[PDB]
Design a protein around this ligand. Sequence first.
Ligand SMILES: NC(=O)C1=CN([C@@H]2O[C@H](COP(=O)(O)OP(=O)(O)OC[C@H]3O[C@@H](n4cnc5c(N)ncnc54)[C@H](OP(=O)(O)O)[C@@H]3O)[C@@H](O)[C@H]2O)C=CC1
Ligand code: SF4
Ligand code: SF4
Ligand code: SF4
Ligand SMILES: [Zn+2]
Lengths: 207, 116, 176, 48, 335, 156, 96
Amino acid sequence: TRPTVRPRNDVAHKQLSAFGEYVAEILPKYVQQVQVSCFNELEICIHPDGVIPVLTFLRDHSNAQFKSLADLTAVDIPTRQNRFEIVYNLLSLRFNSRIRVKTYTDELTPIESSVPVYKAANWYEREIWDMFGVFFANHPDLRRILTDYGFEGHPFRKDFPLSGYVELRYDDEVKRVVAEPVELAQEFRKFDLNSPWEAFPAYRQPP
Amino acid sequence: ASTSVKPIFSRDMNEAKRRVRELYRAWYREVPNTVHLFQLDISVKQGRDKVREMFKKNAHITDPRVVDLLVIKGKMELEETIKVWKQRTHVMRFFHETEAPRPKDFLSKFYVGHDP
Amino acid sequence: TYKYVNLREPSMDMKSVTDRAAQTLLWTELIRGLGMTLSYLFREPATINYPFEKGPLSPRFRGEHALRRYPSGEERCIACKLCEAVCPAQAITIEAEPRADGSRRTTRYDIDMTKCIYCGFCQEACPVDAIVEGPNFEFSTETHEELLYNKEKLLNNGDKWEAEIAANIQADYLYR
Amino acid sequence: PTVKPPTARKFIWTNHKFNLSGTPQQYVPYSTTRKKIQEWVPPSTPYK
Amino acid sequence: LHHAVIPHGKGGRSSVSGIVATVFGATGFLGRYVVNHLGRMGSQVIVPHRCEPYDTMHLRPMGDLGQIIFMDWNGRDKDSIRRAVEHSSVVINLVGREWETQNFDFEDVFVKIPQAIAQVSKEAGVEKFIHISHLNADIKSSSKYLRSKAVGEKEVRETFPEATIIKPAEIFGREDRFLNYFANIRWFGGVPLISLGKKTVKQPVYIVDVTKGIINAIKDPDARGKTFAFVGPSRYLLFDLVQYVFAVAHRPFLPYPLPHFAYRWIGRLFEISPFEPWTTRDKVERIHTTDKILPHLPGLEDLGVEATPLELKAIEVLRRHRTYDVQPAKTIPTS
Amino acid sequence: SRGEYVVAKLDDLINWARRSSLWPMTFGLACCAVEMMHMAAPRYDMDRFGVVFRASPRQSDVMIVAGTLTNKMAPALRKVYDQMPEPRYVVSMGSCANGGGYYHYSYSVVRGCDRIVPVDIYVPGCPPTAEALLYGILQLQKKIKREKRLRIWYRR
Amino acid sequence: GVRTSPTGEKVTHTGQVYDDGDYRKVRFVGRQKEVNENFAIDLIAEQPVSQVGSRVISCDGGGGALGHPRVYINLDKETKTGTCGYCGLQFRQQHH
Ligand SMILES: NC(=O)C1=CN([C@@H]2O[C@H](COP(=O)(O)OP(=O)(O)OC[C@H]3O[C@@H](n4cnc5c(N)ncnc54)[C@H](OP(=O)(O)O)[C@@H]3O)[C@@H](O)[C@H]2O)C=CC1
Ligand code: SF4
Ligand code: SF4
Ligand code: SF4
Ligand SMILES: [Zn+2]
């Protein structure tokens, strides 16, 4: 074998492709795309209306049994009509496999809360709200979790500046900690690192 | 179909305004308790005028979905004050007591710097 | 493979049951714990007599950044700015221009020792062994401004610790 | 050092100095670069 | 001049305001607010201090890195004064004391020391000089505090003609000795007052207003060689003013009269304390002296500062004195 | 005997008592708190200098800020500092507390604890070794040894 | 080497010195200005020019892996010497 190249596992690539088709045949109403990566991970892309149907099927079906929610997060892409891509990472102790379920939304369209399916989603959805501003409908307790009280904006959005808009300080006159517009003694320096030469022709896009 | 979207709480501006007013009543009746629990140095009248100013800024919204979010944030900001999750510093950040006034006219901006 | 940690069935014979009655009434396993602390009372403590004794370190230790010279006295740095590019904290600032004799040399070399994460990437990126982290770890100050090093402070450190810096690099450069 | 003395270089400090914080010998930071923009100097002779 | 210091930025903590100021007596009540306002805009502040460095620690967070610089100085040493002022563009004098010590008397701190600073500032080339006199300064006053103020107010006006002399009334604030003075009398049962507090009228001013006035006098070119009178917006009787304080503090109020000579007798008793005396014969004079009216001098409004009522910010100062709405005291209309 | 001689020796007695019984209140916020625990561990044993392991805020003489100070945490820090009985000193431990360190350019981090409270000693490193924090503590002891409170009161 | 300005403040090897009327000098009152006394431009000028008998010579700074990247220098011009771009040492061809 090649000492420096990661080996391929064609067996697990064939098994995850069979199961991806299996899922898309059972939920045509919701599944829009199923893809398997070159390092054997399975992605089910769904319409946002199927968050509860699709997840419930994967948790409870006898051939899926994805009983553990590994993680739930969001990704921000400003160039899409629906900026926010919601990602569910799931685990199956019965079949020793993982699967990724993805949907989408925007600043104003809500998504159904997953707490009924996974009690683990309670805090993850608050974090997506706090950091991205995606509203989850029917959440038992939705509010900021990580940012400071009274914080304005959603810091993980691609257009929110790195250093924010305000900074804290102690003022002796008013005997408390105050908030003021941010001025930096040394401005963060921006490096343009990307090389002007194509790195990977396998991922080239049509012109 | 492009303009057909899912609502948050209100299906039209008329229902949205109902939520705006209920929120305003909640804030109006809390200022006396807030000015007392946090031992603020402002008066109740100053507190109730700040609430009025905050509502006035977003008075030109005509999107029911946007208004729903503003109410959702308002209810979140309200729950923090009632339960004393905020502190005196957080409440007083609405007033900007330690920031010098910044001029609004062209000549004054010309003398100090380059910003428009 | 797996093992159970707490899946034992206690015996219910009279002798075993009486053994646990003596343990409950006469506090046997509590006095077994007093004995262990008694043993440590007679063991030699592990304390060292700082500042007259010091904790052991190794030639790879990462302490106070410093700027080195060639054996002729010429500065090693040639203002390549690789260290400034790799520093994950952006703690380094550099400015350069041709020197009076035409050499490529810096006119500014600052390290903010309060942004710095003391990671060692600056000395891995350097192609000429100019910026190093020395073995000094006792340089606490009384004001914030004394920790903003400029090129003069960094060159003074290099001249001050060259005897020890060179010996450490001699001891480890075969692993790099 | 007695058994294995260090290499000798003419630029190495001969007199070691301990920590100098809080004394008149403390280090004070400053910019090592010169002025960037030169300002125009008005003429010293009246024009009329 | 080749050029000024060319202010840059947005007026924040890391900006450059072009103000290099030396503040004498910056470790007291008034200097704690002047240094904060100078550092809040990005000014270079040199703070010559006589006390232990531990006692200047509250000033360090008031400026960015390297904007607050501390030096040692001696009141009678001219060389120490020179080191602190030869790099500055404005010098502010806040040196003062409400009692005479073993080594310094009212003459030393209000005449000789202000004269030394003014003379050395002139010889060093400082441009703006700001001296802090008193509103009730008068060489014909029963208080030696107020007599020395007048003498110093003149020798400064002669040594540095282009000085901006600020004459405030009694200042009130969190760390004041004016409202905090009419709240610790409770420790002695009743509230003594001369003539039951009648016949005395006071015009106290807010600390922040006096501080904002000082800053605007530095930046205003029309304040060189001019004298101001920073006074509050209302005039009160010494009785109802003290009555108001005890109402806000929510403490029992027993105002009983005491003759002038008796008050001095108890005044001398406290002066024996080798620490900060609770009260002194001199302090009693100024507390029972009526605040003057000088309409011919510019006031706060001429510097753009709007005077702050004592009612809006009395609670801020007296909140601490409360154990475990108050009706405002009456005022004296201007005829 | 002279007054300047009694005050000089009284200053040495109060300084000796204060620097020999520093009771710290440790604000363990982040990784720097781990190195602070190794200073209390048997290898270095801060307690043998008189520096007790843990002290309550009202029984403490020094505050050690060990970790990243966030904007959601700053008001709590100032409150604890204002309630410390005097004399009180603050030791800033690590790059995060000194100037923000790795998170300097973050929106939720206070760039240095010295803009919230006054600071007496800065201990650099990320984290400082347990022998580097100990060196800083012994440097605060010498600073307290140079105090002249009584010798300045006598000259007022 | 270090030479002092008319006001008594030393000049660094980069040429930095505060003018007489610059307020920034106040940071040095009761303190000192850190200046390194070993000017590298003077130190490398004392090194002798090394005579070699080839058109092209190589420099690695000395110490092998402890020096600088190895570069080859051309000595075809007799008007000037060959200078190393890294360490500043000079080389010359022997009469040809
Ligand atoms: N406070 C008020 O109500 C009024 C103030 N003023 C005047 O304003 C000025 C500020 O006073 P204020 O801050 O309010 O009260 P403070 O007494 O608290 O301030 C006095 C300052 O002057 C210093 N000082 C006193 N004597 C000397 C000396 N020999 N040498 C050096 N410094 C000395 C003190 O330094 P240190 O603490 O180290 O001893 C202190 O910093 C005074 O001149 C006062 O006359 C006038 C009208 C109202
Ligand atoms: S040790 Fe790391 S963070 Fe510190 S200066 Fe070097 S590269 Fe930058
Ligand atoms: S990597 Fe080395 S040679 Fe390059 S700029 Fe940094 S210190 Fe100088
Ligand atoms: S300074 Fe370093 S070790 Fe300390 S809290 Fe920050 S990142 Fe962690
Ligand atoms: Zn070379």
